[PDB]
């Protein structure tokens, strides 16, 4: 009645929703508040004047005729006041639990003796009663900042790779194994130009092209354009990103590179300050004001410049354990036989009594002693030092941005941005909340390098596990790697008696229903799942397909059923029939990702899906287009890219999403592009012995030296890289002689200072 349905959660009044109360709380907790910096007042300039090369893009309507730039004689302090919903005064449709589904689950439990039915109903009701989908609160966000600072500086303070004992080259040798990469396509431009110069526009569809990375148009522009999207500020971003990279390049080759580079960095300070966006999630009601995860929303120009380094490399590097002999999980999909490929790799390891490691950003998976371990970095991003990102930049510029002859696919200006400035713009820099400019501890979550920097930190933890003789994750010896690496982590899952569990999963596989005998019905009694929680997926054995298939981890499935995400796109929500199409999508997607294998959930969701489809026929609205392009309407859209929901879900839909394109032979997987014959273990034993301290390549040696020399030496460094980046006659011997020359002047300790510290100082100058 009103006892079955839990009461709606009404968040308490937030006592820290004012700058005074927020500042006092952070002060009482010793959290660093910066002296606020101001942005010059916006000036409405002619886009034709600011971007003359793109005059044709203005007249064709691809850019606004005016551009607003911070050039004014007066300045302003930026202010960012995000919405937190639901809140004490607004408990509406946003974050509303699916009470209709709870009613349906109860009715079908009344009529069906499903052995897992009572546990499914209780779990959905408990999730509705204890969880809340929403954007948390100011208190939640502020307490989260304290927890991040705690991971960075508390019980286990962060350590740079150098402090742990790795050079840039030693880390690169590990990343060749844990994150194998290819070079960007030959047709893609080198890192040598201003972003706007990557736009080739005239009108001709046969030639017109943009080599810039794809951006989310509806996402936040960030500073200095609060309240604007990326689509709203395209011209502004190009003008600002162009001016920053050009002013940096000029300043570095000026009569005083230290004063020049520092002036540019302070003039564009706001390019290092992220809007502290409250992340929409299924939070615990009891901890609503204790924890709101934060999205560090990078300014559009900073995101564009960073993405120009990473995305041309990563587009060509979808290499993982299912298609390459690497522990990496980058670009993994459990669909189209992905999960069965993983289960084949796991089963072969267990039969051959071999240990196994898998890495995905802040997620580590270890198979040892007939046990599966899921290890996650604790609040990952907070463990990142600017030096971790600098080591990733080294790896991308040496292994990615390199020609076949070994010459660099970048010039000194882009080597300066990537190595000497960029890591301090998004790591240990600052954020904006209300009128408060707060310190950021670690890397800003959501920045372009979030995955890459987290993947490098997990690589360090895994390399140290291999070095320590692979101690079991449940022992003190493994937990001691926290202090050894400066990286906090925790064992999130332990799946004991793995061999036996896989045998049980195969033997308990149902004979009835979906992917079993092929009828359009859930099994009465589902088989045992292999609860790997591999990027949120469990494995279930299919008798029909004779393979393991993925099912969304139970806790995630229940949370998503209890609190569905609605249409979080104003434009699509405005379109007619979209909201009623979303209703069908919600119940079909929950079935697709794994609800099909939960008999109570599948009976209730199928009913909801067909009843919503019947309501659509009554109103006479055609939503076929929306149901075909359902991906953008669902949180589960990012997987099943080529499936349509225009026809109701059947057993054939489940067969199709699990159909492999090719047969799998693990021995047939190509080796990594670099050091193919070497295993991660052989690389670790070499590093332990002191190998790969310095790269053999003089170009790479110059890039490593660049991480150690102060900003006043940048012009000399530019002269050292100029022959190689220009590919002049006999550049190799010239770069070789210039590196040897630069190595000698490095005996002057006064020339040794991290440019990353110099960047941070200038960013925080008043």
């Amino acid at each position: 009645e009103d006892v079955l349905i839990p009461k709606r959660f009404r968040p308490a009044k937030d006592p820290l929703d004012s700058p005074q109360a927020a500042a006092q709380f952070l002060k009482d907790n010793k959290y660093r508040i910066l002296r606020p910096r101001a942005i010059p007042t916006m000036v409405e300039l002619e886009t034709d004047a600011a971007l003359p090369r793109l005059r044709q893009m203005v007249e064709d309507g691809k850019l606004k005729d005016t551009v607003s730039v911070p050039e004014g004689t007066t300045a302003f302090y930026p202010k960012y006041y995000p919405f937190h919903k639901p809140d004490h005064d607004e408990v509406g449709t946003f974050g509303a639990p699916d009470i209709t589904l709870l009613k349906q689950l109860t009715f079908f439990l009344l009529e069906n003796d499903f052995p897992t039915g009572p546990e499914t109903l209780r779990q959905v009701r408990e999730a509705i009663a204890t969880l809340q989908y929403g954007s948390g609160s100011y208190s939640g966000q502020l307490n989260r900042l304290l927890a991040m600072k705690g991971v960075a500086t508390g019980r286990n303070p962060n350590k740079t790779p150098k402090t742990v004992g790795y050079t840039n080259e030693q880390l690169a040798k590990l990343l060749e194994q844990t994150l194998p990469i290819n070079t960007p396509k030959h047709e893609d431009p080198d890192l040598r130009w201003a972003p706007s110069w990557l736009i080739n526009y005239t009108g001709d569809l046969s030639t017109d092209k943009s080599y810039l990375p794809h951006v989310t148009i509806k996402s936040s522009a960030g500073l200095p354009y609060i309240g604007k999207t990326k689509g709203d500020t395209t011209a502004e971003a190009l003008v600002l990103a162009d001016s920053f990279i050009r002013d940096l390049g000029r300043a570095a080759t000026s009569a005083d590179p230290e004063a020049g580079v520092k002036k540019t960095i302070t003039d564009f300070w706001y390019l290092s300050c992220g809007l502290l966006f409250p992340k929409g999630e299924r939070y615990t009601q009891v901890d609503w004001d204790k924890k709101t995860r934060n999205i560090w929303s990078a300014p559009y120009p900073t995101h564009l410049l960073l993405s120009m380094v990473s995305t041309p490399v990563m587009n060509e590097s979808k290499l993982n354990i299912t298609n390459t002999q690497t522990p990496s999980l980058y670009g993994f999909s459990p669909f189209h036989g992905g999960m069965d490929r993983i289960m084949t790799i796991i089963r072969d390891s267990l039969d051959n009594d071999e240990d196994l490691v898998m890495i995905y950003a802040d997620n580590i998976y270890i198979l040892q002693d007939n046990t599966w371990y899921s290890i996650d970095l604790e609040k990952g991003e907070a463990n990142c030092t600017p030096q971790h990102m600098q080591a990733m930049m080294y790896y991308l510029l040496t292994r990615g941005w390199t020609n076949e002859d070994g010459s660099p696919r970048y010039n000194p200006t882009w080597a300066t941005f990537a190595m000497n400035v960029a890591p301090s713009m998004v790591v240990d820099s600052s954020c904006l909340l209300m009128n408060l400019q707060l310190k950021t501890y670690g890397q800003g979550s959501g920045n372009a390098f979030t995955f890459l920097n987290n993947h490098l930190m997990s690589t360090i933890v895994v390399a140290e596990w291999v070095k320590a003789g692979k101690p079991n994750p449940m022992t003190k010896e493994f937990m001691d790697l926290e202090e050894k690496t400066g990286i906090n982590f925790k064992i999130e899952r332990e799946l004991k008696n793995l061999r036996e569990t896989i045998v049980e999963a195969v033997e308990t596989a149902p004979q009835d229903g979906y992917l079993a005998d092929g009828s359009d019905l859930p099994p009465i009694r589902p088989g045992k799942a292999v609860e790997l929680d591999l990027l949120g997926w469990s494995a279930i054995y299919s008798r029909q397909m004779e393979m393991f298939v993925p099912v969304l981890e139970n806790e995630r499935l229940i949370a998503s059923a209890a609190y569905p995400k609605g249409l979080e796109n104003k434009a699509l929500a405005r379109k007619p029939g979209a909201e009623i199409a979303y209703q069908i999508v919600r119940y079909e997607a929950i079935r697709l990702v794994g609800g099909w294998n939960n008999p109570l959930l599948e009976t209730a969701a199928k009913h909801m899906s067909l009843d919503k489809r019947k309501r659509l026929e009554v109103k006479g609205i055609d939503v076929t287009g929306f149901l075909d392009d359902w991906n953008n309407m669902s949180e589960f859209g990012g997987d099943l890219e080529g499936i349509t929901l225009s026809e109701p879900l059947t057993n054939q839909t489940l067969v199709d999403i699990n159909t492999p394109l090719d047969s799998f032979d693990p021995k047939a997987r190509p080796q990594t592009p670099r050091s193919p014959k070497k295993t991660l273990d052989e690389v670790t034993t070499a590093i332990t012995s002191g190998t790969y301290k310095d790269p053999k390549s003089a170009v790479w040696r110059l890039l490593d030296q660049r991480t150690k020399l102060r900003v006043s030496t940048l012009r000399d460094q530019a002269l050292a890289l100029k022959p190689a980046s220009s590919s002049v006659d006999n550049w190799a011997e010239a770069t070789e002689e210039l590196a040897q020359q630069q190595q000698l002047l490095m005996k002057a300790n006064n020339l040794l200072k991290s440019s990353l510290t110099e960047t941070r100082e200038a960013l925080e100058t008043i």
Partner: peptide, 8 residues
């Protein structure tokens, strides 16, 4: 073959 639009 490589896009070359002057470099920064």
């Amino acid at each position: 073959s490589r896009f070359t639009p002057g470099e920064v």
